[PDB]
Amino acid sequence: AAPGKPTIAWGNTKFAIVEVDQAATAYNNLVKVKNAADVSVSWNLWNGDTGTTAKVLLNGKEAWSGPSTGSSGTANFKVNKGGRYQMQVALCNADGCTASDATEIVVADTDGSHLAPLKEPLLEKNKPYKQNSGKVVGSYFVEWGVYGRNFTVDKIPAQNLTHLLYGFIPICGGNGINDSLKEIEGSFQALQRSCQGREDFKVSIHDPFAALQKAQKGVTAWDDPYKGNFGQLMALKQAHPDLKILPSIGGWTLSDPFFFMGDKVKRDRFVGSVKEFLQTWKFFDGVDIDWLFPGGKGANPNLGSPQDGETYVLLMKELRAMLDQLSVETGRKYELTSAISAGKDKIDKVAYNVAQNSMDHIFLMSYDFYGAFDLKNLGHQTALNAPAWKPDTAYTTVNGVNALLAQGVKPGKIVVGTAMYGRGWTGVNGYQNNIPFTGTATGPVKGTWENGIVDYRQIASQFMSGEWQYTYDATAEAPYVFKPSTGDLITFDDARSVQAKGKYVLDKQLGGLFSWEIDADNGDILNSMNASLGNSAGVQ
């Protein structure tokens, strides 16, 4: 007769192919990639013949076998593929095999293969849209938004996007390399902590806690291997296989390191670390380069040179070569994109007509044209065209696009930007013909989280009544609110201005639309981005 039926003994059932130290602060101690997870299982047989051979089955497939020597045993084996498995211990002899009831074991991997899909209902004013326009619909999610702004990955209306960008991935470096970070409390210090023992100019993760250790919906167990933003993004991929999730390197406060990459030694080290990063965090689909900006004029007044244009083109070609090599290794397809200035004076410092050959998309930052950074020359911060009171306005969306086209950039590579926040001034005065933009201000408007900036969500619920005047400039395609008594002026993007941008994109055959930043919208902006680009309503 066949052996008796054994039972599985108490013991941990959660393992991982890629290990993460949930208490680490340094990137070099934070993660360790292995070829497989080391799984262990023990069993007991209280009644019956114990057989002659013991086997471990995973979803019915043999993963281990050995001599059965008694009423109890232990098996140690490797599992090289992530997932949730139905594991059983079977005892066999010449007369047959007898399998125990199944115990679920989890083998985690960074592609999110061990996680149930993170499929959350749409919140606030977000409405469902099908991505059938064939146009890009992207938005940036910020790593630090899980704190003060209290916006997590589960709150992203993911079904309404084709591209989700993660801002921002930093480049290691101390004094003289990341000085721009010193303007934000503890930001410079956090990066040094993360880069402890790591070579300068290699990429890293700015806030390991927010990225991998903070408990969040779907990855809330005290012993889950991947938590925080990355853990949720992994689960999000399971729910949306076609969504492109990209890591964005740089941004306003993390661009200083790019200025040193004219040195091939540093550039090679950088490109190399990006490859290893992508091999480590499998849920990412490529890389987005946000160098602000080649030639200078960024956050650091002491950086920028005429050599930057060449370095940029060299960098993109080198990254594309690295991604091709990675593709032959994994068989996957990777995207290479970049967010750039929309000002003509900056665009011409780079030969995008050449760089475009190794890029999938160009995220034209058609916003921040005006703002509290200049209290004398006011104007629409993200308008499509120039206003009637100054047809020669230099900074507009159309001017940015024309500059690229004039170089030879293919229209299909250009993705137009929308703003999910407004910029404002206070004490505006000395204006003519009831056009506030013609005067001057005395400071920044009180912001939602920081001076001179207001979330669209707050504009819609707080500044659309009372003494606030509302006006939609149909010439420039830009709305704005103004409070005469205090001189508060706010320029932003609304459902209508975004609609104009989308129609413009379809008319000129551009790539689509993207926005900054997802947490600031209440649903109106993204709904319009989708609708204006031709996507049809209804869940898919």
Ligand X SMILES: CC(=O)N[C@@H]1[C@@H](O)[C@H](O[C@@H]2O[C@H](CO)[C@@H](O[C@@H]3O[C@H](CO)[C@@H](O[C@@H]4O[C@H](CO)[C@@H](O[C@@H]5O[C@H](CO)[C@@H](O[C@@H]6O[C@H](CO)[C@@H](O)[C@H](O)[C@H]6NC(C)=O)[C@H](O)[C@H]5NC(C)=O)[C@H](O)[C@H]4NC(C)=O)[C@H](O)[C@H]3NC(C)=O)[C@H](O)[C@H]2NC(C)=O)[C@@H](CO)O[C@H]1O
At position 92, the amino acid (one-letter code) is: C
Name residues contacting ligand X, limited to 414-453 (CB under 6 A). Answer: 421, 449-450, 453
**For ligand X, which stretch binds (CB under 6 A), given 193-201, 270-278, 341-349, 469-477?**
341-349
Q: What's the closest the beta carbon of residue 125 comes to ligand X, in angstroms?
A: 20
CA-to-CA distance for 480 and 487, rounded, in angstroms? Answer: 13
Instruction: Give the span between the Cα atoms of 426 and 489, in whole angstroms.
Output: 6
Nearest-CA neighbor of 58 among 98, 85, 83, 82?
85
Element (H, E) at 386: none
- Contact between 419 and 515 (Cβ < 8 Å): yes
Binders of ligand X in range 142-171 (CB under 6 A): 144, 147-149, 167-168
Q: Could you tell me whether strands 488-491 and 478-483 are parallel, antiparallel, or unpaired per DSSP bridges?
A: antiparallel
Query: 189 or 327, CB closer to ligand X?
Result: 189
The minimum distance between CB 275 and ligand X, in angstroms, equals 22
When asked if residue 258 is in the footprint of ligand X (CB under 6 A), the reply is no
Which of the ranges 6-14, 128-136, 363-371, 494-502 carries the binding residues for ligand X, by CB under 6 A? 363-371
Give the SS3 label for residue 65. strand
Pick the closer one to ligand X by CB: 131 or 393. 393
Of 225 and 387, the one with the shorter C-beta distance to ligand X is 387
The helices-and-strands tally (H runs, E runs) of the chain is 12, 25
Among 64, 252, 431, 468, binds ligand X (CB under 6 A): 252
**C-alpha torsion sign, points 451, 452, 455, 457:** positive
> Minimum distance from CB of 486 to ligand X (Å)?
22
State in angstroms the smallest separation of the CB of 187 from ligand X. 5
What's the length of the chain?
540
**Least separation in angstroms between CB 498 and ligand X:** 16
Residue 455 interacting with ligand X (CB under 6 A): no
Question: Which amino acid is located at 415 in the chain?
Answer: V
**Judged by CB under 6 A, which stretch of 62-70, 119-127, 139-147, 469-477 contacts ligand X?**
139-147
- Say if residue 270 is preceded by a cis peptide, omega within 30 of 0: no
Contact region for ligand X (CB under 6 A) — 30-38, 119-127, 131-139, 366-374? 366-374
Exactly one of 110, 133, 253, 535 binds ligand X (CB under 6 A); that residue is 253
**Site membership for ligand X, residue 79 (CB under 6 A):** no
Binding mask 288-327 for ligand X (x = CB under 6 A): --x-x-----------------------------------
- Contact between residue 283 and residue 230 where contact means Cβ atoms under 8 Å apart: yes
User: Tokens representing 1?
Assistant: 């007769």
- Subset of 17-76 contacting ligand X (CB under 6 A): none
Q: How many residues bind ligand X (CB under 6 A)?
A: 31
Q: From CA 75, how far away is CA 202, in angstroms rounded?
A: 40
Token digits of residue 510 = 């551009």
140 binds ligand X (CB under 6 A): yes
C-alpha distances (whole Å) from 406 to each of 75, 267, 399 are 67, 29, 10
* 482 lines the binding site for ligand X (CB under 6 A): no
CA distance 195 to 331: 31
φ and ψ at 229, to 5 degrees? -60, -45
Note the residues at the interface with ligand X (CB under 6 A).
Answer: 140, 144, 147-149, 167-168, 184, 187, 207, 251-254, 290, 292, 339, 341-343, 365, 368-369, 373, 395, 421, 449-450, 453, 516-517
